[PDB]
Design a protein around this ligand. Sequence first.
Ligand code: 017
Lengths: 99, 99
Amino acid sequence: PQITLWKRPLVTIKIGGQLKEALLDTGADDTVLEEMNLPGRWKPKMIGGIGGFIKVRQYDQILIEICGHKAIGTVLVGPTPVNIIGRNLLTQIGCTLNF
Amino acid sequence: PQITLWKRPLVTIKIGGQLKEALLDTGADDTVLEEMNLPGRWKPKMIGGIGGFIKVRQYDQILIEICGHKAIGTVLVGPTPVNIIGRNLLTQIGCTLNF
Ligand SMILES: CC(C)CN(C[C@@H](O)[C@H](Cc1ccccc1)NC(=O)O[C@H]1CO[C@H]2OCC[C@H]21)S(=O)(=O)c1ccc(N)cc1
């Protein structure tokens, strides 16, 4: 589809058998999701933006479905205020900026 | 143009007569630029990011050119890790997400 930017680009995603709302964020290098209890191994990581850094858990090869489009890659989990779909997965669903 | 997301969507902007690199950031409601001198009045404001809140100077009705496209709107200036172009300006240049 085509998503205008009048409002926040929030879409429904599916991860770990759960449905969530997430932001399609071209400004985010990597996907970061609100705290959740994913199974599997993970590695600690810190990501920075406006306001400083937060500590997150980096899971690899996580399957995410974004508006019916399937994607698999790195998913960070931590105390982010919003679920954020980053470029690492936006590329896998064929997402582009157009103006 | 059509911008893919394998790399950061960085573009050259023109503001206050100066050229700069900025990130097209669909996850940002507002436009936040690194420290710089801008003409015109400004009020103190606060914005929150993934890591907390920062102090910024709010400039209203600022002309800014993004890849040749002209926009006039609010520009926040403060200690952001990177110049980000938010939806308040992305809408003015007719920017959309497409997948
Ligand atoms: C600052 C950017 C270069 C990077 N950020 C993505 C960005 O889209 C955030 C993503 C974001 C969105 C909402 C809340 C927190 C973070 N938006 C943001 O900070 O916007 C602020 C300015 O306009 C306002 O609108 C939202 C917050 C304000 S980030 O959240 O810090 C981030 C950094 C690294 C990763 N892997 C994932 C996300």
